[PDB]
């Protein structure tokens, strides 16, 4: 036995870390100085194809250990994007009923996909900005004590899945890590992976990549202004890079072209930040081993037209598109 | 842990389907009849075709057919094209895919994203004029090499040396192996390996019903019989309709949370038929089946929702 599992939930994490020899500023050290290396952590190697499998499973089993989820409970979650798929898969495999509260703009194709997983989907209506999914789910949950809202936006088990998973896994394959670059959505990946790495690597850099394009996890929400995510700790990040549509898209196209990795649209932001951090490593003469997260694959996004034709069409195509 | 995407190939998960299995748990009603899903969507481009693609290039290199400036030519519109694009690129070859004018526009962009040049064969000459045009094209100069997945023993060898050993390692109690019949590489290579090392193992082909295409699968009456195909290897063959393939594919998501492509439904239908028969016979079964790819490329086809009749 090398990879025999009794359930799909066991085939989670322990994802590949793949060196990018072509796309890296300099893979081999030499005459002009130390190497600047990019390493890609392939989180699409997960049950549903995204990094959200980790926190989804960890939230349920924390809720079990905490005694909130008992055998016949229904999980109620305000959601969008990859978390919808991950929670649907995880709830089912764990024997729970799931209701997803989703913003009224969710596609019918995506509704039907989650319903095939067994989730009941409730659309909140929202005559305002993007939606009211959270407050609706919170009210529904208040209706029945065996109805439990996990709330990924503020659930510590979100960041714990990366402190206990993504982080230790990174440090095991990349003891020489100098930088960690990931997308900033709920902040779980950054806060959890980052706290772990900072406790073990003396001045590792934790770099937030922040897409300026599409829609993120908080899109389904009405937020207070210039908000702070509930999971966010202000002393973990050492840097943030804000990344535009055109830059994101050509980085994603380059990754496929030169490394054969077909990544999701959030990885464009991550790659751009990473390459900019890398270009700094010797403008400064310094060595770099930069781990970067590929949080999902392109399959889900190629319908968009974001990988085809002109970068103008691609940029236009990213409008209104969930990247998380 | 990998210096290259190509190292992250094979060694795929085998996952027990506790809910969808006829009988997961041995009881006093009789022995277990278990389904185990071999997840080949966990390969670099998301399909089982990364295996033969990588091995066919490797073999061609060994045979002295491929030197630095070579272009590989292959007739393919499907998963082999994608696999060979990724693999050719990382190995530093050029790839031309030959597909008919009638092929989609979505694939074009997919294949060209992975770095592939596309030449269009005459429309209304099927995937056969496509093969003949590719042969003709490759004959125009020695720098152009056609691998030819339907006759290339490296396709089979990839499964003999990869898929088979992995299955045996993870599922030593295996009684049945079930896979779709397309090039036949998967069944032939893994079947031959398992039959060498597992005394009474049964190798079961899932084929499409005549005229009812199931993506990636071939019916050998209707189509050309791949040169790779050895009749003696198979102990059984099930023909699977579209409706059955589609409803098994949906049922795999619903019961097991695995989002697979439609060949996996066909394979599931054959496997459930085998399992049903074992259940009724009172005989234990551990049935390994191939999940060849994921459902993403099929979902716009409307066959994960709506009526089964509308699944086209």
Curated annotation (Swiss-Prot), chain A:
E.C. number: 2.5.1.113
Pathway, per record: Amino-acid biosynthesis; L-cysteine biosynthesis
One of the Pfam families matching this protein, by short name: PALP
Sample GO molecular function, one term: cysteine synthase activity
UniProtKB keywords: Amino-acid biosynthesis, Cysteine biosynthesis, Pyridoxal phosphate, Transferase
Superkingdom as given in the UniProt entry: Bacteria
Catalytic activities: [CysO sulfur-carrier protein]-C-terminal-Gly-aminoethanethioate + O-phospho-L-serine + H(+) = [CysO sulfur-carrier protein]-Gly-NH-CH2-C(O)-S-L-Cys + phosphate
Name of the top EC class for this enzyme: transferase
CDD domains on file: CBS_like
Cofactor(s) in the UniProt record: pyridoxal 5'-phosphate
Gene3D superfamilies associated with the record: 3.40.50.1100
InterPro entries listed in its UniProt record: Cys_synth, Cys_Synth/Cystath_Beta-Synth, P-phosphate_BS, TrpB-like_PALP, TrpB-like_PALP_sf
Residue numbers binding pyridoxal 5'-phosphate: 82, 185-189, 266
One GO term (biological process): cysteine biosynthetic process from serine
List of residues that carry N6-(pyridoxal phosphate)lysine: 52
Subunit structure: Homodimer.
PANTHER family for the chain: CYSTATHIONINE BETA-SYNTHASE
Protein name listed in UniProt: O-phosphoserine sulfhydrylase
């Amino acid at each position: 036995h090398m990879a025999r599992y009794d359930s799909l939930l066991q085939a989670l994490g322990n994802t590949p870390l793949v060196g990018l020899q072509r796309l890296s500023p300099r893979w081999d050290d030499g005459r002009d100085g130390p190497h600047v290396r990019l390493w890609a952590k392939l989180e699409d190697r997960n049950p549903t194809g995204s990094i959200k499998d980790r926190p989804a499973v960890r939230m349920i089993e924390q809720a079990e250990a905490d005694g909130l989820l008992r055998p016949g409970a229904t999980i109620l979650e305000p959601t969008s994007g990859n978390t919808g798929i991950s929670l649907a898969m995880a709830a089912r495999l764990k024997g729970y009923r799931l209701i997803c509260v989703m913003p009224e703009n969710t596609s019918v194709e995506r509704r039907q996909l989650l319903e095939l997983y067994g989730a009941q989907i409730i659309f909140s209506a929202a005559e305002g900005g993007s939606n009211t999914a959270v407050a609706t789910a919170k009210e529904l949950a208040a209706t029945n004590p065996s109805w439990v809202m996990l709330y990924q936006y503020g659930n510590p088990a979100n960041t714990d899945s990366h402190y206990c998973g993504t982080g230790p896994e990174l440090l095991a394959d990349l003891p020489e890590i100098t930088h960690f670059v990931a997308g900033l959505g709920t902040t779980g990946t950054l806060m959890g992976t980052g706290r772990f790495l900072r406790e073990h690597v003396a001045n590792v850099k934790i770099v937030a990549a922040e897409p300026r394009y599409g829609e993120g996890v908080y899109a389904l929400r009405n937020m207070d202004e210039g908000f702070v995510p509930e999971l966010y700790d202000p002393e973990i990040l050492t840097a943030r890079y804000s990344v535009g549509a055109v830059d994101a898209v050509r980085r994603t196209r380059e990754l496929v072209h030169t490394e054969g990795i077909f990544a999701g649209i959030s990885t464009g932001a991550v790659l751009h930040a990473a390459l900019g951090v890398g270009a700094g490593a010797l403008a400064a003469g310094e060595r770099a081993d930069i781990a970067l997260v590929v949080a999902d694959a392109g399959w889900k996004y190629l319908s968009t037209g974001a990988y085809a034709g002109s970068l103008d069409d691609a940029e236009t195509a990213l409008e209104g598109q969930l990247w998380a």
